[PDB]
Design a protein around this motif. Structure first.
Motif, PDB file in Angstrom:
ATOM      1  N   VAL A  35      -1.890  -7.670   5.181  1.00  0.00           N
ATOM      2  CA  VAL A  35      -1.171  -6.427   4.912  1.00  0.00           C
ATOM      3  C   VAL A  35      -1.886  -5.285   5.611  1.00  0.00           C
ATOM      4  O   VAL A  35      -3.028  -5.440   6.053  1.00  0.00           O
ATOM      5  CB  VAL A  35      -1.112  -6.113   3.397  1.00  0.00           C
ATOM      6  CG1 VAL A  35      -0.382  -7.221   2.662  1.00  0.00           C
ATOM      7  CG2 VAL A  35      -2.524  -5.927   2.835  1.00  0.00           C
ATOM      8  N   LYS A  37      -4.014  -2.000   5.988  1.00  0.00           N
ATOM      9  CA  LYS A  37      -5.076  -1.348   5.238  1.00  0.00           C
ATOM     10  C   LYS A  37      -5.521  -0.162   6.077  1.00  0.00           C
ATOM     11  O   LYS A  37      -5.676  -0.284   7.294  1.00  0.00           O
ATOM     12  CB  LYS A  37      -6.244  -2.311   4.999  1.00  0.00           C
ATOM     13  CG  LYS A  37      -5.851  -3.538   4.201  1.00  0.00           C
ATOM     14  CD  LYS A  37      -6.935  -3.956   3.236  1.00  0.00           C
ATOM     15  CE  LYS A  37      -6.339  -4.749   2.088  1.00  0.00           C
ATOM     16  NZ  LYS A  37      -5.284  -3.962   1.368  1.00  0.00           N
ATOM     17  N   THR A  43      -3.858   0.227   0.941  1.00  0.00           N
ATOM     18  CA  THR A  43      -2.491   0.071   1.441  1.00  0.00           C
ATOM     19  C   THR A  43      -1.676   1.215   0.821  1.00  0.00           C
ATOM     20  O   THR A  43      -0.914   1.016  -0.126  1.00  0.00           O
ATOM     21  CB  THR A  43      -1.896  -1.295   1.023  1.00  0.00           C
ATOM     22  OG1 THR A  43      -2.749  -2.348   1.495  1.00  0.00           O
ATOM     23  CG2 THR A  43      -0.491  -1.477   1.595  1.00  0.00           C
ATOM     24  N   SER A 242       9.266  -4.425   4.297  1.00  0.00           N
ATOM     25  CA  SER A 242       7.972  -4.543   3.634  1.00  0.00           C
ATOM     26  C   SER A 242       6.851  -3.795   4.334  1.00  0.00           C
ATOM     27  O   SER A 242       6.127  -3.024   3.700  1.00  0.00           O
ATOM     28  CB  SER A 242       7.577  -6.015   3.511  1.00  0.00           C
ATOM     29  OG  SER A 242       8.532  -6.753   2.778  1.00  0.00           O
ATOM     30  N   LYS A 243       6.700  -4.034   5.632  1.00  0.00           N
ATOM     31  CA  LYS A 243       5.642  -3.396   6.397  1.00  0.00           C
ATOM     32  C   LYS A 243       5.980  -2.019   6.931  1.00  0.00           C
ATOM     33  O   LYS A 243       5.337  -1.053   6.546  1.00  0.00           O
ATOM     34  CB  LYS A 243       5.173  -4.284   7.544  1.00  0.00           C
ATOM     35  CG  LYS A 243       4.543  -5.583   7.108  1.00  0.00           C
ATOM     36  CD  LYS A 243       5.595  -6.626   6.871  1.00  0.00           C
ATOM     37  CE  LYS A 243       4.985  -7.997   6.679  1.00  0.00           C
ATOM     38  NZ  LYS A 243       5.921  -9.016   7.133  1.00  0.00           N
ATOM     39  N   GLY A 246       6.217   0.007   4.099  1.00  0.00           N
ATOM     40  CA  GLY A 246       5.117  -0.130   3.161  1.00  0.00           C
ATOM     41  C   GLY A 246       5.558  -0.344   1.728  1.00  0.00           C
ATOM     42  O   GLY A 246       4.943   0.192   0.807  1.00  0.00           O
ATOM     43  N   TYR A 248       6.111  -3.594   0.370  1.00  0.00           N
ATOM     44  CA  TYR A 248       5.963  -5.040   0.246  1.00  0.00           C
ATOM     45  C   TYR A 248       6.554  -5.623  -1.043  1.00  0.00           C
ATOM     46  O   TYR A 248       7.541  -6.356  -1.004  1.00  0.00           O
ATOM     47  CB  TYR A 248       4.477  -5.430   0.323  1.00  0.00           C
ATOM     48  CG  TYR A 248       3.713  -4.829   1.480  1.00  0.00           C
ATOM     49  CD1 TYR A 248       3.251  -3.514   1.427  1.00  0.00           C
ATOM     50  CD2 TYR A 248       3.453  -5.572   2.638  1.00  0.00           C
ATOM     51  CE1 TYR A 248       2.552  -2.954   2.491  1.00  0.00           C
ATOM     52  CE2 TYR A 248       2.752  -5.020   3.708  1.00  0.00           C
ATOM     53  CZ  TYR A 248       2.305  -3.711   3.627  1.00  0.00           C
ATOM     54  OH  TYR A 248       1.581  -3.162   4.665  1.00  0.00           O
ATOM     55  N   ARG A 249       5.976  -5.246  -2.181  1.00  0.00           N
ATOM     56  CA  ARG A 249       6.400  -5.755  -3.484  1.00  0.00           C
ATOM     57  C   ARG A 249       7.811  -5.418  -3.953  1.00  0.00           C
ATOM     58  O   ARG A 249       8.306  -6.029  -4.910  1.00  0.00           O
ATOM     59  CB  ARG A 249       5.400  -5.346  -4.567  1.00  0.00           C
ATOM     60  CG  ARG A 249       5.348  -3.860  -4.839  1.00  0.00           C
ATOM     61  CD  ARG A 249       4.358  -3.546  -5.937  1.00  0.00           C
ATOM     62  NE  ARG A 249       3.001  -3.939  -5.577  1.00  0.00           N
ATOM     63  CZ  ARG A 249       1.931  -3.755  -6.344  1.00  0.00           C
ATOM     64  NH1 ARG A 249       2.046  -3.187  -7.536  1.00  0.00           N
ATOM     65  NH2 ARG A 249       0.739  -4.147  -5.917  1.00  0.00           N
TER      66      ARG A 249
ATOM     67  N   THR B  56      -0.257   1.840  -4.893  1.00  0.00           N
ATOM     68  CA  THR B  56      -0.011   0.870  -3.814  1.00  0.00           C
ATOM     69  C   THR B  56       1.199  -0.022  -4.078  1.00  0.00           C
ATOM     70  O   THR B  56       1.564  -0.256  -5.228  1.00  0.00           O
ATOM     71  CB  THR B  56      -1.223  -0.072  -3.602  1.00  0.00           C
ATOM     72  OG1 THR B  56      -0.969  -0.936  -2.488  1.00  0.00           O
ATOM     73  CG2 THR B  56      -1.460  -0.929  -4.836  1.00  0.00           C
ATOM     74  N   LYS B  57       1.826  -0.502  -3.006  1.00  0.00           N
ATOM     75  CA  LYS B  57       2.975  -1.399  -3.119  1.00  0.00           C
ATOM     76  C   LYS B  57       2.732  -2.710  -2.371  1.00  0.00           C
ATOM     77  O   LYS B  57       3.687  -3.383  -1.975  1.00  0.00           O
ATOM     78  CB  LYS B  57       4.261  -0.729  -2.621  1.00  0.00           C
ATOM     79  CG  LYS B  57       4.820   0.325  -3.563  1.00  0.00           C
ATOM     80  CD  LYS B  57       6.053   0.986  -2.974  1.00  0.00           C
ATOM     81  CE  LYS B  57       6.519   2.154  -3.825  1.00  0.00           C
ATOM     82  NZ  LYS B  57       7.168   1.711  -5.087  1.00  0.00           N
ATOM     83  N   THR B  58       1.462  -3.082  -2.201  1.00  0.00           N
ATOM     84  CA  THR B  58       1.103  -4.322  -1.512  1.00  0.00           C
ATOM     85  C   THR B  58       1.662  -5.518  -2.259  1.00  0.00           C
ATOM     86  O   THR B  58       2.073  -5.406  -3.415  1.00  0.00           O
ATOM     87  CB  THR B  58      -0.425  -4.552  -1.442  1.00  0.00           C
ATOM     88  OG1 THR B  58      -1.137  -3.421  -1.957  1.00  0.00           O
ATOM     89  CG2 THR B  58      -0.843  -4.804  -0.020  1.00  0.00           C
ATOM     90  N   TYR B  59       1.652  -6.674  -1.604  1.00  0.00           N
ATOM     91  CA  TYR B  59       2.145  -7.896  -2.222  1.00  0.00           C
ATOM     92  C   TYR B  59       1.400  -8.103  -3.529  1.00  0.00           C
ATOM     93  O   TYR B  59       0.227  -7.770  -3.639  1.00  0.00           O
ATOM     94  CB  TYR B  59       1.942  -9.091  -1.291  1.00  0.00           C
ATOM     95  CG  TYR B  59       2.837  -9.058  -0.079  1.00  0.00           C
ATOM     96  CD1 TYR B  59       4.226  -9.053  -0.215  1.00  0.00           C
ATOM     97  CD2 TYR B  59       2.298  -9.032   1.200  1.00  0.00           C
ATOM     98  CE1 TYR B  59       5.050  -9.021   0.885  1.00  0.00           C
ATOM     99  CE2 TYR B  59       3.115  -9.002   2.320  1.00  0.00           C
ATOM    100  CZ  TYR B  59       4.491  -8.995   2.157  1.00  0.00           C
ATOM    101  OH  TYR B  59       5.306  -8.949   3.266  1.00  0.00           O
ATOM    102  N   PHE B 279       9.251  -6.331  -8.072  1.00  0.00           N
ATOM    103  CA  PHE B 279       8.296  -5.690  -8.969  1.00  0.00           C
ATOM    104  C   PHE B 279       8.843  -4.633  -9.937  1.00  0.00           C
ATOM    105  O   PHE B 279       8.634  -4.722 -11.143  1.00  0.00           O
ATOM    106  CB  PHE B 279       7.166  -5.083  -8.128  1.00  0.00           C
ATOM    107  CG  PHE B 279       6.107  -4.383  -8.926  1.00  0.00           C
ATOM    108  CD1 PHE B 279       5.027  -5.093  -9.443  1.00  0.00           C
ATOM    109  CD2 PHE B 279       6.158  -2.999  -9.120  1.00  0.00           C
ATOM    110  CE1 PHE B 279       4.011  -4.438 -10.141  1.00  0.00           C
ATOM    111  CE2 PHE B 279       5.149  -2.336  -9.815  1.00  0.00           C
ATOM    112  CZ  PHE B 279       4.072  -3.056 -10.326  1.00  0.00           C
TER     113      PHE B 279
END
Ligand SMILES: *Cc1c(COP(=O)(O)O)cnc(C)c1O
Ligand SMILES: *Cc1c(COP(=O)(O)O)cnc(C)c1O
Ligand SMILES: O=C(O)CCc1c[nH]c2ccccc12
Lengths: 394, 388
Positions: A35, A37, A43, A242-243, A246, A248-249, B56-59, B279
């Motif tokens: 991901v 950083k 992130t 996702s990228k 930003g 992703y989730r 953050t919204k990372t995996y 999420f």
């Protein structure tokens, strides 16, 4: 009954991070992350994204069931982001999905419906999830040369010879840009030739677009997708937000089906909506709404493009730096490809033994195939990485 | 290639939605006195808080967030939650949970057969047809009394072989509104145990029947009698977050070892379908459930919805009785949930659609939440004006 279940392998990534955390070394580095950083190893939530969620919180009056195949505002925005002026709405079927992976899965499902004897061609190498999904579906998978282990560039001649073997109805999977994991990409002239191979063989192209805006720019990175979309009648695109957004989730992505005519387009749109319905019914609204709000609101779209470009340039300067250090340390051309690659990943072309040597002697961690995350580098780590590469005999 | 696409049949319930004195009485969404599906207070505060705390919204977690899994298991099974033998999977809505449930079952047993109630939620057979799984039905709705044909139900279930799956609704039966009593549940548990069938409980309306804890009573009974059960939960209705697409699949196992297999296969199942689960909706739910202040207000609001609807069924039943002088439509006040099968014939059902404008599902399924003091007399009048 559940005891007859076969043990499925762990996500792997978790095991990878597990070893990293165990390492008692003070100055260890992690380039295995997949991901983005920033300078502080975080992130961040894009400003535009945080602004969209804020707006949403003030205007959304209900959360009732919405569009089964997604919301128009989103489908249009995505179609324009990817295809630009070339978006032939009349022949384009769109489907909001659970991330790019969802788009990919559905794309494979749709094609298999239209043709049971579908064969898939994937690059050597390609994102591991590709092969797993296809393996899970039981689809026959074929490989086509791509990464030249010597120059770390694209083995175009080999890719061409191998693609020539594809026939009518086969599916050729292409990364639109920023090839994950390698980082080596096709030039517009190479895309044009590939287009000719596709017209000749009659194979259906499936374009994985997950990094638009991380290469040379939003428009630039969509150039190839657009060249294909212009010459090939039927094209499948799996986009991810996702990228480049930003989020992703949030699980935001979409499947685009370019058809030769309207009747077919309606047939494809109906089949797509059917696919969502039978899998999880309606797709996740939140992320898709953050995206369409940014793209439709000029103030937000402007700040988003600005931030992404900042990201892109940052990673680029990092590539230039790394390559520069490598030029001093080796006194040769060899590692110039680092600055030629595009995306946030790059394959150093190191062997597993060399990868192990680096970890044990320098405390630097990277994926076993020598894939590194450029975003993980910095003014302090580059010197260490560069020295390690040279030292281990890469 | 795509030109070979065989045209696929549409979802009737949602079809009417597009086709829609124009009184809507179809889609299973809740609506307030002013025909609106409002956002719940707690949910709104949850999002507000999330907007400030999330950095953050990372995996994230492939099987869902640990906070979400724990809260959900406790909401459904209460103190019967044996986490050591329970595997959880955060999914895309309750529908995704059902699909994932069918995938896991077939994975563990290729020669799996599924029993569904006559009648049941259309989407059930739809998905099973797509998957190519043999569907068998068990008698459930007692056409005449609008209640449950229990004797017929028990007789059919007894015919199930082990390794077969039985799809039961935890509460608020869609489309009938007819539900089993706790005593009947114990009976069903007896049969399931003797036959060796795996119960798949569809829990989509916890909190709309008799109350949060009461609506889960049946599910908890089976969870204690049967060593292995699957529960497909939906947060869409009781949290009013339909479009977020959030629910979860709970796999109850006889031992920790089997549990590890199931969990592994469940995560793998998400990875091959769409990678990580959504999420946002999961987060709203867990925040609410773990924030005493928020859970308190949510329960209160959900109690208000539940009582209001019961109040409506009561008004309607009353008018129906005072419009014919008979206890015929008494079933209306007996049924639980937001639906109720009037038992009306298709000719009548389709008839009232135009000159009247009252849209109800072709099988006479009416969403009680669509009714209101103003529409009730008109509906009752319509029912009498037509046939039954
Ligand atoms: C990251 C990535 C995706 C994105 O998957 P999501 O489901 O959007 O998180 C898809 N394809 C490739 C090749 C990727 O690198
Ligand atoms: C609502 C409902 C579901 C699940 O719906 P999701 O929108 O997928 O959460 C499943 N079964 C029944 C009977 C339902 O009414
Ligand atoms: O009316 C219902 O049965 C609930 C809402 C509903 C209708 N079709 C659906 C398909 C998938 C998920 C939910 C629904």
């Amino acid at each position: 009954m559940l005891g007859n279940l076969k043990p499925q392998a762990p996500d792997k990534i978790l095991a990878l991070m597990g070893e990293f955390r165990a390492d008692p070394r003070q100055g260890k580095i992690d380039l295995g992350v997949g991901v983005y950083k920033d300078a502080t190893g975080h992130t961040p939530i894009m400003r535009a994204v945080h602004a969209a969620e804020q707006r949403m919180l003030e205007t959304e009056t209900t959360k009732t069931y919405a569009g089964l195949s997604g919301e128009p505002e989103f489908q249009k925005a995505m179609g324009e982001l990817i295809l630009g002026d070339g978006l032939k709405s009349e022949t384009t079927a769109t489907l909001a999905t659970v991330g790019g992976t969802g788009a990919l899965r559905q794309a494979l499902e749709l094609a298999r419906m239209a043709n049971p004897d579908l064969r898939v061609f994937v690059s050597d190498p390609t994102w591991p999830n590709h092969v797993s999904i296809m393996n899970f579906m039981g689809l026959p998978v074929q490989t086509y040369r791509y990464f030249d282990a010597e120059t770390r560039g694209v083995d175009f001649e080999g890719m061409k010879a191998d693609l020539a073997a594809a026939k009518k109805g086969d599916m050729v999977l292409l990364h639109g840009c920023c090839h994950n994991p390698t980082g080596a990409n096709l030039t517009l002239d190479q895309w044009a030739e590939i287009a000719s191979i596709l017209e000749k063989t009659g194979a259906l192209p499936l374009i994985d677009l997950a990094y638009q805006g991380f290469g040379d720019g939003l428009e630039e990175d969509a150039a190839g997708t657009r060249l294909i979309a212009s010459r090939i009648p039927e094209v499948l695109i799996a986009a991810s937000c996702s990228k480049n957004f930003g989020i992703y989730r949030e699980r935001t992505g979409c499947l685009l089906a370019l058809c030769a005519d309207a009747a077919t387009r309606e047939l494809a749109q109906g089949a797509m909506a059917f696919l969502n319905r039978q899998t999880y019914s309606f797709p996740p609204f939140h992320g898709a709404k953050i995206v369409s709000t940014v793209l439709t609101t000029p103030e937000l779209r402007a700040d988003w493009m600005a931030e992404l470009e900042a990201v892109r340039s940052g990673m680029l300067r990092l590539r230039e730096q790394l390559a520069g250090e490598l030029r001093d340390l080796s006194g040769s051309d060899r590692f110039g490809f680092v600055a030629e690659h595009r995306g946030m990943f790059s394959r150093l072309g190191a062997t597993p033994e060399q990868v192990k040597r680096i970890k044990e002697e320098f405390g630097i961690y990277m994926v076993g195939d020598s894939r590194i995350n450029i975003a993980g580098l910095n003014d302090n780590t580059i010197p260490i990485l560069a020295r390690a590469i040279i030292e281990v005999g890469v």
